[PDB]
Design a protein around this ligand. Structure first.
Ligand code: HEM
Ligand code: HEM
Ligand SMILES: Cc1cc(N)nc(CCc2cccc([C@@H](O)Cc3cc(C)cc(N)n3)c2)c1
Ligand SMILES: Cc1cc(N)nc(CCc2cccc([C@@H](O)Cc3cc(C)cc(N)n3)c2)c1
Ligand SMILES: C[C@H](O)[C@H](O)[C@H]1CNc2nc(N)[nH]c(=O)c2N1
Ligand SMILES: C[C@H](O)[C@H](O)[C@H]1CNc2nc(N)[nH]c(=O)c2N1
Ligand SMILES: [Zn+2]
Lengths: 411, 407
């Protein structure tokens, strides 16, 4: 069965057949849409179908479907599963797998870049210290002195789920936050809980507004250990505004490398539970969400103050006014320092073109509108007017519970 | 099956039980989410009627009472005979108010229980419909102190006797494309603005030309009528800071009044049912003025602001968009015409959601439509998980008359 999506701005219609190859389930039914819900160990029995499915895709993409090499590989994975209850991916398979997961990520506006991903294979890693080493090379390579490059590092897959590799950090680089006894937060409120663990694990806290957290790393199901990213490796950008000279005196800066480290890469039924990946920022991620969410740095008040806006009635749109100024400043700061960044008009325009192309070549592009539309200026970007279909393909990135909620402490 | 929703800005958690009473379908399956898609007999009539009368009698705490059963009985008899039935006034009022209460795409529902219902079921002609509509407009407008209202024309019968209002809103500006290539006035209304001339309207050939009402009673060819200009309240748009703003010569009408929808009560189809309330600011400033296939004034306003229009990253569109929206709010407020800003309306709807969770056990809401088209993440609805499902009574879309009416 075929499906059509329409663009309401341009009247362009497209046709999805790709949703037919859809394995996983959405959370919705005929009677309920869960489209805005934030969050919607394997036996051999369930493993071999998922293995075969994946290897069938892999072998079409290299145009060797049904080849002797396709058949032998199947045969060999089969054997290894019945013998060992799991299997190992070839290098090329891991590469293709990680690229496809990104490509299938329906919540990512950045997917035009999907085919340029530097995959680091850290499947020989055995210790935390090893993890730290791999991650440092990740950070340095992806940073590339401000000329950011997409990359991901892949640690050893789950086995019995008692020997997990995890990167406790949600991102490799993120600022501390510290709840004060008067109730106010210093630094990033998003990171309070994780900062406390870090403190607990013996991290000595500088207790400033922009302290970079230490990596907290678990190998082979062991207790996690702390490590300090070398600060020479952490690219940061001081936030100034092109016209507003007082802007710099707000004391704000942000780091340049967005690197998500808490998700799970599923490839052919294998679970890679530490797979930190990184790209570059869309301006709004910092300027709208990081600075301006009420449960984050929440600088709207102080920026609006300094702008002397009328703050006495919301109807003055003073909140909206400051929000724009702050995003102007984020883009200007990064561009001035030659650190890769993309604005939301440009990101969304690019994505429309990716999506169209994806329909042409692939028969579809799963896309989550709730997440693809930017958190400011929604309707003046072309994605707002784009109908999208959301469905789950593997390989894929999935969420996983926070490790402190599930970890068996060794002491 | 007892579902939770979380606010991620406040950690507030509500449990939804109301979705279990869902009678309509979404477009979504286990395998595909369609959340972002704009438009996805005696027999079936009795259950629909029963289900409706059941909620009615329950709402007035007379569930399973004498009066309840008798009514079920009476409606049963009438169906058996006439192949339809008629709603009592009280039911009609409940039906409409509830159709609005169940509108998952509407942010303005905190107001749902104060809808003024005008029973136009006794109407028989376009002139009649015109008269009923003018009274609606005048009552609703109320000199700027806008009031919610809906006017209900007769229900569908055999579906060749349909009452329809061909306009998509009662009050909308004409659109005509010119030899030059582009468009004058409002590009959304081009096709209809033609159907009006292709029907005999002389057009004042201007921008903000209020279009003629085009009315269809009992299935007949539809007829033209000009709403007395004195009944169309308009607001000249100016900026509280920028005096050149007014020189763009922009105005907007005060009365948003949707007129092409179909209202379904207890299986009955009210296909002419224009309803109106008041504007949230962004509807005009973000959508009407700034959409590319609408008035598209951003490029023009940005100029007068002397912004850097060289590169997308100066956020000039965004900068302008805010000022425009300041100007709309400012003007309406100055002229004491009712209007609500997106911050206030979303705060109100969060409050409404609260209310509905504890009083009704839930509140269907379509996130894609509830979050405003600007400044999304700084309004509280952005961070609010919503569950979307279809309840009844309801408003529903229906095909453009001209594609359908037998001429
Ligand atoms: C090229 C630079 C990139 C940009 C500008 C970009 C943009 C984004 C943005 C704006 C979001 C929504 C995040 C939010 O606002 O909360 C997102 C989500 C996502 N992105 Fe991309 N992205 C990029 C690279 C990548 C890479 C390299 C991967 C993995 C290989 C990736 C995978 C995802 C995933 C899995 C999500 C969903 C997160 C979730 O479900 O919580 N992104 N991306
Ligand atoms: C009180 C002032 C009101 C405000 C501020 C309000 C606000 C809104 C907004 C912002 C939308 C999304 C529309 C768009 O962007 O195109 C909306 C849609 C809707 N509203 Fe309300 N509304 C109000 C009164 C009413 C009344 C009186 C009714 C009916 C009695 C109603 C029923 C609907 C319906 C049925 C839709 C969209 C239907 C669809 O597309 O499926 N609204 N309204
Ligand atoms: C609070 C919260 C709740 C929840 N249920 N899920 C989440 C995860 C969502 C998320 C949060 C921050 C950063 C990203 C990331 O997606 C940010 C990112 C990553 C990459 C690689 C590139 C880029 N431009 N941006 C994703 C967060
Ligand atoms: C182009 C298009 C195509 C399509 N298939 N559907 C639509 C959506 C239908 C719609 C359009 C404009 C305004 C409203 C209305 O929702 C606008 C409105 C109505 C009321 C009563 C109050 C208020 N504040 N605002 C509804 C649009
Ligand atoms: C494609 C997308 O579904 C469509 O543009 C929707 C999105 N959200 C909307 N939200 C509102 N309030 N009004 C709209 O017209 C739309 N349009
Ligand atoms: C409730 C809702 O799902 C949630 O607040 C979402 C909405 N859209 C988003 N979109 C992006 N890009 N990032 C987010 O964190 C969110 N949060
Ligand atoms: Zn859905």
């Amino acid at each position: 069965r075929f499906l059509k999506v329409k663009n309401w701005e341009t009247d362009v219609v497209l046709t999805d057949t790709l949703h037919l190859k859809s394995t996983l389930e959405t959370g919705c039914t005929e009677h309920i849409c869960m489209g805005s819900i934030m969050l919607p160990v394997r036996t051999k029995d369930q493993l071999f179908p998922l293995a075969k499915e994946f290897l069938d895709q892999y072998y079409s993409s290299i145009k060797r479907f049904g080849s002797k090499a396709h058949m032998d590989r199947l045969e060999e994975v089969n054997k290894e599963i019945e013998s060992t209850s799991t299997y190992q991916l070839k290098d090329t398979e891991l590469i293709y797998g990680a690229k496809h997961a990104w490509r299938n990520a329906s919540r990512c506006v950045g997917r035009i870049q999907w085919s340029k991903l530097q995959v680091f294979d850290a499947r020989d890693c055995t210790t935390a210290h090893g993890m730290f080493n791999y991650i440092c090379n990740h950070v340095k390579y992806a940073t590339n002195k401000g000329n950011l490059r997409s990359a991901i590092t892949i640690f050893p897959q789950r086995t019995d789920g008692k020997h997990d590799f995890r990167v406790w950090n949600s991102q490799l680089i993120r600022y501390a936050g510290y709840k004060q006894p008067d109730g106010s937060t210093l630094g990033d409120p998003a990171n309070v809980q994780f900062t406390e663990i870090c403190i607990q694990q013996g991290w000595k806290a500088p207790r400033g507004r922009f302290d970079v957290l230490p990596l907290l790393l678990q190998a082979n199901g062991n207790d996690p250990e702390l490590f300090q990213i070398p600060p020479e490796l952490v690219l940061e950008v001081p936030i100034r505004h092109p016209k507003f000279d007082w802007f710099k005196d707000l004391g704000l800066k942000w780091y340049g490398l967005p690197a998500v480290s808490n998700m799970l890469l599923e490839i052919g039924g294998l679970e890679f539970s530490a797979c930190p990946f990184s790209g570059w920022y869309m301006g709004t991620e910092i300027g709208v969400r990081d600075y301006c969410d009420n449960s984050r740095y929440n600088i709207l008040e102080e920026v609006a103050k300094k702008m002397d806006l009328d703050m006495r009635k919301t109807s003055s749109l003073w909140k909206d006014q400051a929000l724009v100024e702050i995003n102007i400043a984020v883009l200007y700061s990064f561009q001035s320092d030659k650190v890769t960044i993309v604005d939301h008009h440009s990101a969304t325009e690019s994505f429309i073109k990716h999506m169209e192309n994806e329909y042409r070549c692939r028969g579809g592009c799963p896309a989550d509108w709730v997440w693809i539309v930017p958190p400011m200026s929604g309707s003046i970007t072309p994605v707002f007017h784009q109908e999208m279909l959301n469905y789950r393909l593997t390989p894929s990135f999935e969420y996983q519970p926070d490790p402190w909620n599930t970890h068996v402490w060794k002491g």
